[PDB]
């Protein structure tokens, strides 16, 4: 129970429909490789779309990214408590949240339904989680690698994916076409014929 | 293997901020600044985890204060609009007499300020609609999803009306059953 947040401190200085805009972004990022085995933490600061200063756990301190962040690197790196904290984030924040989130993000599984039709055959796979998926086209038990073109992985925004993989077919009812999907939600390839 | 991102921003002079978490490109949750409440993207996540909402506002406050700081340091160099790339498709593949939802994807824009309407036959529709908050991109633009459940009919013709300062006029993405 109980999700964790990383904070920020003020940079160096002071405060405080066609009108010009100004945007500030902060991105606190946790990268996990092979579960929580190796983990990397980036405390990222943005003006408009530009990364001006960064804490990278693999470096151990703040470093200017552009000349804009130069004064923030010095400033923050002098708050020895701030650095101690950011250096713990890999464990107190990243590994923390991975553990709290694990069962319903990392371990979330939803079955793909793989329909097949034309409107060149569309084999369309919908509403699966997670994104990792393989979609193989088959021609009489032989994998057709050529004349296959695809939609890419499509992120629905609601924690489901969909992908359309179209195969070019010689327009005569010569033989059976098998579209076979593989996914971590399934224990055996889910195949789907058409002849 | 995995990425989790706490992504926030503050925007002048709209004075609007946002705080959310990203998992492999989906939103885990975001805090409703106005309502001071945590909104889980799927109802269930809140059964498994909690997040104390007022903390985000504290963050936003620092975001604000930095923005003010950066603005000056750049000599008030503002943001260059960057128009979106709409796209409309269907959740499941289409069928006649069978229910379905219409996803409108608004990609690669900035600042994160936009106006999305859903119409059918050139007339505004909003029954059952929904949207997500501005979401993060590795190039530091944003995405955003608007949702409209509906019913396959031959006669009906839908458009996702999308306006944004980088655009030079509103933007329509026609969609109809084929």
């Amino acid at each position, epitope marked *: 129970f109980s999700w964790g947040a990383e904070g920020q401190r003020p940079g160096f200085g002071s405060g405080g429909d066609t009108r010009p805009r100004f945007l500030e972004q902060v991105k606190h990022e946790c990268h996990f490789f092979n579960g929580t085995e190796r983990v990397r933490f980036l405390d990222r600061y943005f003006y408009h779309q530009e990364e001006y200063v960064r804490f990278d756990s693999d470096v151990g301190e703040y470093r200017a990214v552009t000349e804009l962040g130069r004064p923030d690197a010095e400033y923050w790196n002098s708050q020895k408590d701030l650095l101690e904290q950011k250096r713990a984030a890999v464990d107190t924040y990243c590994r923390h949240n991975y553990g709290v989130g694990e069962s319903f993000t990392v371990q979330r599984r939803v079955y793909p339904e793989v329909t097949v039709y034309p409107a060149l055959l569309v084999c369309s796979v919908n509403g699966f989680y997670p994104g990792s998926i393989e979609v193989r086209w088959f021609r009489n038990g032989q994998e057709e690698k050529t004349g296959v073109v695809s939609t890419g992985l499509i992120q629905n925004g609601d924690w489901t994916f969909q992908t359309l993989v179209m195969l070019e077919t010689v327009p005569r009812s010569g033989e059976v076409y098998t579209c076979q999907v593989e996914h971590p939600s399934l224990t055996s390839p889910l195949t789907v014929e058409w002849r | 293997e995995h990425v989790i991102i706490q992504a926030e921003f503050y925007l002048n002079p709209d004075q609007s901020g946002e705080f959310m978490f990203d998992f492999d490109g989906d939103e885990i949750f975001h805090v409703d600044m106005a309502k001071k409440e945590t909104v889980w993207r799927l109802e269930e996540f809140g059964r498994f985890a909690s997040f104390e909402a*007022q903390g985000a506002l504290a963050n936003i406050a620092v975001d604000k204060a930095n923005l003010e700081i950066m603005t000056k340091r750049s000599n008030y160099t503002p943001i260059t609009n960057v128009p979106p790339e709409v796209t409309v498709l269907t959740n499941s593949p289409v069928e006649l007499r069978e229910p379905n939802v219409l996803i409108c994807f608004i990609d690669k824009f900035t600042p994160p300020v936009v106006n999305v309407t859903w119409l059918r036959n050139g007339k505004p529709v909003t029954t059952g609609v929904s949207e997500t908050v501005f979401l993060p991109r590795e190039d530091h633009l944003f995405r955003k999803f608007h949702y409209l459940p509906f019913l396959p009919s031959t006669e009906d013709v839908y458009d996702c009306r999308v306006e944004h300062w980088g655009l030079d006029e509103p933007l329509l993405k026609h969609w109809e059953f084929d």
Partner: T-cell receptor
Framework: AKTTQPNSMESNEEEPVHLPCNHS???????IHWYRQLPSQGPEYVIH???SNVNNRMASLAIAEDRKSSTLILHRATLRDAAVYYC???????????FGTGTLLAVQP | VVSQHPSWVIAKSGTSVKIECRSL??????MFWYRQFPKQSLMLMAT?????????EQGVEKDKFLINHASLTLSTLTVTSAHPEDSSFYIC????????????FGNGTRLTVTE
């Protein structure tokens, strides 16, 4: 708020004192913090930690292996060490600092 | 460092008392307001995030106290309709950041109200 202390403790000067705190629901993203307050002043930071041991001049903090309790250790008590001692939690799950009822420590001359 | 002002305050009923909490040597993103009655503990009243409407803790009388946070260096508490029951110790703290940034306390303002 999420901590529990003995309301008061008695102790002799020149002896070390061990102030106990329970905090059995503390998140692994929050830290254990200790503050003390003299009779009419604001509270002041004494020490804080995450796990295991922490020490500074005159004062140490011993956190149990499971993080469900901790101890503030005063190595040698002076008469001026007599205060209210507050065990609090503060961190990544907890953005406000709430003081509980604390422990009222007397240092017998 | 953070300084409250004034340290000591005597006020007649129904007046209004103004306490200032200022962070001398840093930008305060959040100011907290605590008060403490005799024999009792510190209790949080309100949380102020710079350039925003303060949030009050439950059980806290909504209209009685007023925060004005406009500076990022200054926050101002105002007690309205001074009542003897508001004779208490009042403490503010400034935080230069959010999660895990240290609170810095004023040294308090001792308020007594007599009709």
């Amino acid at each position: 708020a999420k901590t529990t202390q003995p309301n008061s403790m008695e102790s002799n000067e020149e002896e070390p004192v061990h102030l106990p705190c329970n905090h059995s629901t503390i998140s692994g993203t929050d830290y254990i913090h200790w503050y003390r307050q003299l009779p009419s002043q604001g509270p002041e930071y004494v020490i804080h930690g995450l796990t295991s041991n922490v020490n500074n001049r005159m004062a140490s903090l011993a956190i149990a292996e499971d993080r469900k309790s901790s101890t503030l250790i005063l190595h040698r008590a002076t008469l001026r060490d007599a205060a209210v001692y507050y065990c609090t939690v503060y961190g990544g799950a907890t953005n406000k600092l709430i003081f509980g009822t604390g422990t009222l420590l007397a240092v017998q001359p | 460092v953070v300084s409250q002002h004034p340290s000591w305050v005597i006020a007649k009923s129904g007046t209004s008392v103004k306490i200032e909490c200022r962070s001398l040597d840093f930008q305060a993103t959040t100011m907290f307001w605590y008060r403490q009655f005799p024999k009792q503990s510190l209790m949080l009243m309100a949380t102020s995030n710079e350039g925003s409407k303060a949030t009050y803790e439950q059980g806290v009388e909504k209209d009685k106290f007023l925060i004005n946070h406009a500076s990022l260096t200054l926050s101002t508490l105002t007690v309205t309709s001074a009542h003897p029951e508001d004779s208490s110790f009042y403490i503010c703290s400034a935080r230069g950041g959010s999660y895990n940034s240290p609170l810095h306390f004023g040294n308090g303002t001792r308020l007594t109200v007599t009709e």
